[model samples]
Target: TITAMVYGDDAVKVQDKAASRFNASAEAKKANAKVKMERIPASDYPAKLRTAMGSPNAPDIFFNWGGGSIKAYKEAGQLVDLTDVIKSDEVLSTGFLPSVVAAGSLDGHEYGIPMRGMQPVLLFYNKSVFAEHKLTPPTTWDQLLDNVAKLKKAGVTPFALGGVEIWPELMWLEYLVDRIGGPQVFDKIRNGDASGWGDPAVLKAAQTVKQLVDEGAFGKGFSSVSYNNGGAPALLAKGKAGMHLMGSWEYSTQLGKFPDFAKKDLGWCAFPSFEGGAGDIRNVVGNPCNYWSVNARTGNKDGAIAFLRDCASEAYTKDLIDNGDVPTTTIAENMLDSSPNPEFAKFQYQLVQKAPNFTLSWDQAVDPDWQQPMLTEINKLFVGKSSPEQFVSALKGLK
Candidate 1:
C-alpha cells in the first residue's frame, strides 16, 4: 500500500475523497495499486512533515507548494528526483502547461507535479447588492473607488477585509504595488536587482493602502476580525459588502455553504493597472496550488509515480474541471463547455490566450523567515500602528 500525506484546512475530507476516487478509478486500478491518505491541518502540516521525514516510516508521497517551499526539501534531499519520469511520459508532458512545469523544476530536475494554478486575487461581489444599487462592475481603479464609495453611501460596507491573518490584509499592498510598479517592478524585486522599500513604487503602494483605509473602503471593525469568524464571507453573503478579494478556492466553500448563490454572481478580473505603470490589466497574480511531490524514502516509488501519471492524465483533468478545481493541463482549453464553473473557465481561457505575466504569491515565493515580518509590518499599517514609510522600511529591512 502507498501512503500519502496532504495538508490543508479541508484536507481530511477533500484529499481523502480525491484519493479514494482516484484509487477506485478504472485508470488507477489498471496500475494494480492502492493509496491511503493522511490529512493534517494546514497550520500543523509543515511541522508534521518535518517530523515524518526524520522518521523511518515517512509517507510515500506528500503535497507541497512549489517555489521557495520546495527549495528546502530539495536541499535536504528529502524529495525524489522525477526528472526521468516526467520527461519519459509524453502524455503527462503534454498535459501540463509548460510554464507550470518550469515552476516545478529546480536546476532542471523536476521535483513535483502541478495540480491547480490559480490567478489574480479576484474581487467576489454580491450580484444582488450590485443589482439593487443599479451598479455595473467597475473596469478601472477610479471607477472601483467610486463604486465602493457608492456602496458605503447606500449603507452597505464597500469591502470585506479580515486583517487578523495579516497575509489577507497585505494583499491590499500587493494589489497597489502590482498596479503602480507593474510586472517589471515585480521581476526586479524577485531577481534581487531591486532592493529597499524606499523606492517610489514601494512607498506609493503603501500609501495607496493607507488611502483605502482613510477613505473607508474596508468595513468597520476590520482590525479585529478573525479570518474564521465569518467576517469576510458574512459580508459577501449578507449583501453588506459589495466585494471580497480572495482566491479561487473560495468557490467550493461558497457553493457548499451558500447554495442560493450562483456562479454567475462572481465577477473575475485582474487587478486594474494605474496610468503609466509597467503592468497591464492582464498581468496576473497566481501560482500552482497543491503540488504533488514524491518521497525519496518511499518503498513504492514506481507506484507513486504511476499514480501521479494517472492524476495528470486527460481523464483526471476532466474530473478536476467537473469538481471545480482548475486543471494544470492545456487540454482543458478545448473542453471549456464542460467546465462546472464557467466563470473560472473564462478566466482560465483568458489567462492562456493572453499569456499574462504571472506573479507568484509573496508568502509562497518569499522566504518564510521574511514572510512573517513582512506581514507584521503590513498589519501594523492597517491598524495605524505604522505609517506607509515605516511599512516600506520594514520590507526593505528583510534580507
Candidate 2:
C-alpha cells in the first residue's frame, strides 16, 4: 500500500478524487499498489511530516510548497529526483506552464509536480478611479509615478498598504528587487547566501521603498491600517485608494466584502518594468502553487508517479476551476470561461502563463530561521524606523 499525505484543508477533496481514480486504474493494478490518503492537520503538518519521514511509516507521496519547503528533504536524499523523468515524459514536460514547473525546482533539479492553484501577486487598481482620473494601468515605472502624482492631486491615496501587516510591506521590496536586479538577486538569498542581501538591487529596492514612503505613495496613517480586518481593501473598493499590490486572493477577499466593486470596478495588471532593469515585465512573484513530491523510498515508484500524473489530467483541471482556483495546467486557459468570473480568471491564468520566472514569496522561500528577522526589518523600513542602508545591513546580518 502507498500512503499519500496532504495538509488537511478543503482542497484535500481534490486529492481524494485523484487517489480514487488512480486506485481504480490499470496502472495501479500493474504496479500491485493501492493508495491510502492521509490528511495531516494544516497547523501541525510540517512537524508531523518531519516525524513521519524519520520513521518506517514515511509516506510514499506527500504535498509540499516546492522551493525551500522541500530543500531539507532534498539534502537528506529523501526525495525522488524527477528532473530527467519529467524532461523525457511528454505528458509531464508539456503539461504545465514552464515557469510554474521551474518555480518548484531546487538548484536545477525538479522534485515536484504542480497540483494546486496559482496565486501571482498583481498591481490591482480601481477601474472607476483610473477612468475618472484618465489614467491607464502602468507598464513602466515613469507612468506609474505619473499616475501616482495625478491621483494625489485628485485627493486619492495613490496606493493602499496594510502596513500593520509586515507581509504586505514585504511585497514592495520583493517586486522592486526583482524588477531592479531580476529574480536571481532573491534567488541567491533564498538559496542560503546571506551576502545576497547586500546585492545592489536589494539596496536599490529598499531605497525605492523609502522614496515611495517619503512621497506619500501610501497615504499617511497607512501604518495603522490592516489587511486582515479589511481596511486596505475598503480603501481601494471605495475609491479612497487608487491601487493595491497584493496576492490574487485580493479578488476573493473583495468579492466577499464588496461584491459590487469586485465584479464591476476592480482591474488588475502586471507589476511594471523598471527602466534598464534586468527583469522582464512578464516575470512574476507570489505563491506559484503547491506541489506533490514522491518519496525516494517508496515501495511503488511507478504507481506514485502514475498517481502524480493525474494532476495534469483534464478532469483535475476542471475540478480546480470549479473550485474557483486558477490551475497551472497548460490547458487551463481554454477551460477558464466556465469559471465564476471568467475575465478575472483568464487574466490570472495568462499572467502566470506568460511569466518568464515566477519567484516564490520571500518569506516562504527563505530558510526557516530567516523568516521573522526579515519581516522585522521590512516592518522597520516601512515605518521609518530604519534607513534603506540600515535595512540592508540588518538583513545581511541575519544568521
Candidate 3:
C-alpha cells in the first residue's frame, strides 16, 4: 500500500479522488500497489508531518510547501531524488510551468511535483468601494498611499489586515522587499545567509511597513482582527475595508462568504511597483503552489511515482479548475474556460506564467529553525515594539 498524506481542506477532495482513480489504473496493477490517503488537519500539518517522519509508519508520499518545507527530509536522505526522473519522463518534465517545478527544489535538484494551484499574492479590493470613491487600483507606491489617505477620509479602513495573526502581516514585507531589493535579497536569506537581512532593501521595506502602520493604512484595532476566523475578509466584503493584500485564495474566501460581493465587487491587481526599486512589477511572492514529495524508503517507489504523475494529467487539472483553482500544469491554460471564474482564473494563470521570478513565502522559504524567531521580529516590527533599524539588526542576528 502507498500511503499518501495530504493537508485536510476542501481541496483534499480533489487529491482523494485522484488517489481513487490512480488505484484502479494499470500503473497501480503494474506496481502491485494501491494508494491509501491520510488527511491531516491543515493547521496541525507541519508538526504532524514531523512526528510521522520519525515513526515507522511514515507516509510513502506527503504534501509540502516546497523550499525549506522539504529541506530537512531531503538533507536527512529521507526523500527520493526525482531530478533525473523528471527529466527522463515526458509527462513529468513538460507537465507543469517551469518556474513552479523549480521553486520546490533544493540546491538545483527536484524533490517534489506540483500538485495544487498557484497562489500568488494579490492586491484585492472592493469594487463598489473603489468606484464610489472614484478610485482605481494603484499601480505605484505613491498612488497606493494616496488611495489610503482618500479611503481614510471616506471613513473606510484603507486595507484589511489580520495583524492578530502574524503571517497575514508577512505579506506586506514580502512584496516590499521584492520590489525594493529584487528577489535576490531573500534568495540569499533562503539559502541560509542571515546577513542578507542586512541589505538596505530590508530596512527600507521595514520602514515602509512602519510608515503604513503609523499612518493608519490598516485602520485602528487591526491587531485584533483575524483572517483565519474571517474578520479581515468580512471587512472587505462589508465595505468596511477598501483593500486587502493577500494570497489568491482570498477570491475563494470572498466567494464562499459573500457570493454577491465576490461576483460583483471583488477586484484584483498586481502589487504596486515601488519608485526606483530593482524588482519588476510582475515579480510574485506567495506559496507558488503545494507539492507532493516521495519518501525514499517507500516500499513501492514506482507506485509513489505513478500517483505523483497523475497530478500532471488533464483529469487533475480539470478537478482543480472546477474547484476554482488555477492549476500550474501547462495544459491548465486552455482548460481554465471551465473554471468557476474564468476571468480571474486566466489572470492568475498568466501572472505566474509571465513573472520574471516567483518567490516562495518568506516563512516557508527559510529554514524551520528560523521561522518563529523571524516571525517574532516581524510581529514586533508591526506592533511598534521594534524600530526599523532594530528589526533589521534583530533579523541579521538570526542564526
Winner on lDDT between 1 and 3 is 3
Clashes of 3: 0
lDDT of 1 by residue, 1-399 (tens): 788888755424545655777788775676676888887788898889888877888888887766556667777888988777788887667767655555435555778776654444666788888998987777678878888789989998887887788777866666677777775564455433226456687888888788888888986688777546666776677777888777665566566666576355655455565766655666555554457899887877766877787666666666666666666677776766677777676676566445545556667756556667777888888888889888877777777
lDDT of 3 by residue, 1-399 (tens): 999899998789999889889988998899998999899998999999999998898999999988899888988899999999999888898998888887777777888899999999999999999999999999999999999999999999999999888989999999999999998888888878899999999999999999999999988788899998999999999999999999998998998898899999999999999999999889999988899999988999988888888999999999999888899999887888999889999999999999888888988989989999999999999999999999999989988
Maximum-lDDT candidate: 3
| Cα-based TM-score, every candidate | 0.82, 0.96, 0.95
- Position 166, candidate 2: lDDT: 82
Instruction: Tell me the deviation in Å of residue 180 in model 3.
Output: 1.2
Model 2 residue-pair collision total: 0
lDDT of 1 at 15: 52
